[PDB]
């Protein structure tokens, strides 16, 4: 079972190990051009914005077996989350869709 809080936590761990990041580039087995370029700063700023959106959610929505479902039955909740996080209604549905795809593969993991 992959909840929205679970996704929140994975995002924290991924951001944390980001810097760190130098050591990771000094280990073989990752093929050619491992982390080059250069889109690790923008990529992390994205996870942080999704985290701020989930900061507007409550415990029921966060620990729900299917957080996306809690918003399908009560679309009023979507409006609140968007208000509190300074984001648009579409942005919250996007996060919800992404969470759906994330949770699908986690059980497929």
């Amino acid at each position: 079972q992959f909840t929205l809080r679970d996704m929140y936590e994975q995002f924290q761990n991924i951001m944390k190990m980001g810097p760190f990041s130098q050591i990771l580039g000094m280990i073989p087995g990752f093929g050619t051009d491992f982390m080059s370029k250069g889109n690790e700063q923008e990529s992390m700023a994205r996870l942080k914005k999704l985290m701020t959106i989930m900061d507007s959610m409550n415990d029921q929505e966060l620990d729900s077996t299917d957080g996306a479902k809690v918003f399908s039955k009560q679309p009023g909740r979507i409006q609140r989350v968007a208000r509190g996080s300074g984001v648009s209604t579409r942005d919250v549905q996007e996060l919800l869709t992404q969470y759906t795809k994330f949770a699908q593969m986690v059980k497929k993991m």
Binding site: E42, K49, D91
Partner: peptide
């Protein structure tokens, strides 16, 4: 793990314009 987790994290930030 590092691939998807990092790649999904990456793919998400780009797609979500705000």
């Amino acid at each position: 793990l590092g691939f998807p987790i990092n790649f999904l994290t990456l793919y998400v930030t780009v797609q979500h314009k705000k």
